[PDB]
Design a protein around this ligand. Structure first.
Ligand SMILES: [Ca+2]
Ligand SMILES: [Ca+2]
Ligand SMILES: [Ca+2]
Length: 316
């Protein structure tokens, strides 16, 4: 319950020697895409931030700008995502899932359902600092309904603390989800939003066990994934992050490749975001749950340099 990542600090690290090798790779006609990917997937984000700085000191050019202008396609996206400061990554993804016409409900849900209260608290903050707006005013302007109210509950980064579990309560709560389950998460929404958004994790895992003993089914079993509802999808992402974040992302990754095509926007966002948190645990849930390794699914769904950088990120 000690999460491991797939990317560690490279050594021996020489930011100046790394910046000089990237310049050369990009300098002139064409590009050496392979020196680029070898450096970027074997340096962690802090290190990358230090290569960016060195690069700006030595040539008076911007590394990202240069990647952007030299690279192309998904390889470009991947590399540019690797380069984004970890501190801003989430705030940035949220600015774009929201900005423009429509909304990307998907990023909304993934990030709010999966990040820790501390991580939500940091995001709200970097967002205010960088974009100048209040995260909350925005979500609230793009979404509506119970969907909207559950994201706001989640944005308070206020779930109860893991202490004493009172079984009576565990018991009261199970009886109400049981009932809403039967109702197709159709009503008394206000009540199950209160329960799922605010109770501690230890208290809700207990609730789900209890729930299973009343009904004979697991709470997620009472909601179709593939089909609709934005709130349903958000309820589902919460339930699963409550039991295991790594399992939730393994499954997220699996559905980004199963069937014709790939949701490359999700493949990349996840691979990058969790590369230094729980990407190894995720690879483990994927294999136990999917019967395939992340590596082989990715080998098969992607191609080229985009594919080799992803496989280096992945690790085995
Ligand atoms: Ca060039
Ligand atoms: Ca929008
Ligand atoms: Ca596919």
């Amino acid at each position: 319950k000690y999460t491991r990542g797939t990317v560690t600090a490279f050594s021996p690290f020489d930011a100046r020697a790394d910046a000089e090798a990237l310049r050369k790779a990009m300098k002139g006609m064409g590009t050496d895409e392979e020196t680029i990917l070898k450096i970027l997937t074997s340096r962690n984000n802090a290190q990358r931030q230090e290569i960016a700085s060195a690069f700006k000191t030595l040539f008076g050019r911007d590394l990202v700008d240069d990647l952007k202008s030299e690279l192309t396609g998904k390889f470009e996206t991947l590399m540019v995502s690797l380069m984004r400061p970890a501190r801003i990554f989430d705030a940035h993804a949220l600015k774009h899932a929201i900005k423009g016409a429509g909304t990307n409900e998907k990023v909304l849900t993934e990030i709010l359902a999966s990040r820790t209260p501390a991580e939500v608290q940091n995001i709200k903050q970097v967002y205010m600092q960088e974009y100048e707006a209040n995260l909350e005013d925005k979500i609230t302007g793009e979404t509506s309904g119970h969907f909207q109210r559950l994201l706001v509950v989640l944005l308070q980064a206020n779930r109860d603390p893991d202490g004493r579990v009172e079984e009576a309560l565990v018991e009261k709560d199970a009886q109400v989800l049981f009932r809403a389950g039967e109702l197709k998460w159709g009503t008394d929404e206000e009540t199950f939003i209160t329960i799922l958004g605010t109770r501690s994790v230890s208290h809700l895992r207990r609730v789900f066990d209890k729930y299973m003993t009343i009904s004979g089914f697991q709470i997620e079993e009472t909601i179709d994934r593939e089909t609709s509802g934005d709130l349903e999808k958000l309820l589902l992402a919460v339930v699963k992050c409550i039991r295991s974040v790594p399992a939730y992302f393994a499954e997220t990754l699996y559905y980004s490749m199963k069937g014709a095509g790939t949701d490359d926007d999700t493949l990349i966002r996840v691979m990058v975001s969790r590369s230094e948190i729980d990407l190894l645990d995720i690879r483990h849930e994927f294999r136990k749950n999917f019967a395939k390794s992340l590596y082989q699914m990715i080998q098969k769904d992607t191609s080229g340099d985009y594919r080799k950088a992803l496989l280096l990120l992945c690790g085995g």
